[PDB]
Subunit: 51 residues, 2 copies
């Protein structure tokens, strides 16, 4: 008969200085830490792959 | 006494397929062909240089 301790869940730091436990719940509510203007995507492969 | 021949000024191409002779004016009215989202700049130098 032994006792288990409980360690409190850590928190991550999203935009606006806000904190949360789930990344999906912090990104959808507050946003990413730093902002970029867009993603210029390069693609390699067959035309079917590009489609 | 010799003669000369005139060569018409060429026209450069800009956004929306608009032709012009001056690059500055064509950029001012219509704009570039490309669509950059933004420029992320890295600065190297002393603190006075960064300022």
């Amino acid at each position: 008969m032994k006792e288990l301790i409980y360690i409190e869940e850590p928190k991550i730091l999203f935009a606006h200085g806000q904190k949360c436990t789930d990344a999906r719940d912090g990104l959808a509510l507050f946003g990413p830490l730093n902002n970029l203007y867009g993603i210029k995507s390069g693609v390699i492969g067959t035309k079917q792959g590009l489609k």
